[PDB]
Design a protein around this ligand. Structure first.
Ligand SMILES: CNc1c(F)c(S(N)(=O)=O)c(F)c(F)c1S(=O)(=O)CCc1ccccc1
Ligand SMILES: [Zn+2]
Length: 258
């Protein structure tokens, strides 16, 4: 009876195994755009993905993960609100059963169809597993997806999904360039928060871009053909793998713009 994205094992149950679920800096949150504070001290985000080296794509049972070789100083996130250098380790998405839901963060209560998480760890902690044990261990760049025109830089991911349909499947995934997933603007909101799945560790500086990317209905439809189950088990479509917004408690969301 492990955690997941259903009635008896979904987000409202996670606190029994992971009591930090009711902690002081949980994610996601609703972003109140009127209450977010413009912070003229915030720097432009520096996203340096030119040398990123993707390796593989994996269905981990609740998302698909595009993994990068993070053993050199390649794909890094810096600036913005961050004090160090954070290295890209992987990206994944959260999405809905319907276009009207799927994002984890919300913007004035608006839910997007999906949300992309580009996950980076602080190089001062040496590796990802040590970083998640620190309050400044991770920087996650969150990007909303809306349904409209296709995202061409997404299609290589979409097309490999039929090869990783079920939990535990992987496929080689080299030469994927994550710059194809970024909107034109790097304007953002930022706040201190957590992993949005168990173990829910309070280790994340969230950086959420204001500008969504467009993907086509056919692209998100292929996300929804994935399965939470393993091969040879009853089929459970991988949909609604998002945590709802959590209490903001004693936090301020800062805006890089306006
Ligand atoms: C990639 N690591 C990761 C993560 F990025 C996030 S999120 N949604 O970005 O805060 C999580 F919520 C999260 F829980 C993890 S995990 O590696 O500890 C547990 C395994 C896992 C892997 C992929 C997606 C979610 C959780
Ligand atoms: Zn995520």
């Amino acid at each position: 009876h492990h955690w997941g994205y259903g009635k008896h094992n979904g987000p409202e149950h996670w606190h029994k195994d992971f009591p930090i679920a009711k902690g002081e800096r949980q994610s996601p949150v609703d972003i109140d755009t009127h209450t977010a504070k413009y912070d003229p001290s915030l720097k432009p985000l520096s996203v340096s993905y030119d040398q990123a080296t993707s390796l593989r794509i994996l269905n981990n049972g609740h998302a698909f993960n595009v993994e990068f070789d993070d053993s050199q100083d390649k794909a890094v996130l810096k600036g913005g609100p961050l004090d160090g250098t954070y290295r890209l380790i992987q990206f994944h998405f959260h999405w809905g059963s319907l276009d009207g839901q799927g994002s984890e963060h919300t913007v004035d209560k608006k839910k997007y169809a999906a949300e992309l998480h580009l996950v980076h760890w602080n190089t001062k902690y040496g590796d990802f597993g040590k970083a998640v044990q620190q309050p400044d261990g991770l920087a996650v760049l969150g990007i909303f997806l809306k349904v409209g025109s296709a995202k061409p830089g997404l299609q290589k991911v979409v097309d490999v999904l039929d090869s990783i349909k079920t939990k535990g499947k992987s496929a080689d995934f080299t030469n994927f360039d994550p710059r194809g997933l970024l909107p034109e603007s790097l304007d953002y909101w930022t706040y201190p928060g957590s992993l949005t799945t168990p173990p829910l560790l309070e280790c994340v500086t969230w950086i959420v871009l204001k500008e969504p990317i467009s993907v086509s209905s056919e692209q998100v439809l292929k996300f929804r053909k994935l399965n939470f189950n393993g091969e040879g088990e009853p089929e459970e479509l991988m949909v609604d793998n998002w945590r709802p917004a959590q209490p903001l408690k004693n936090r301020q969301i800062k805006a890089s713009f306006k």
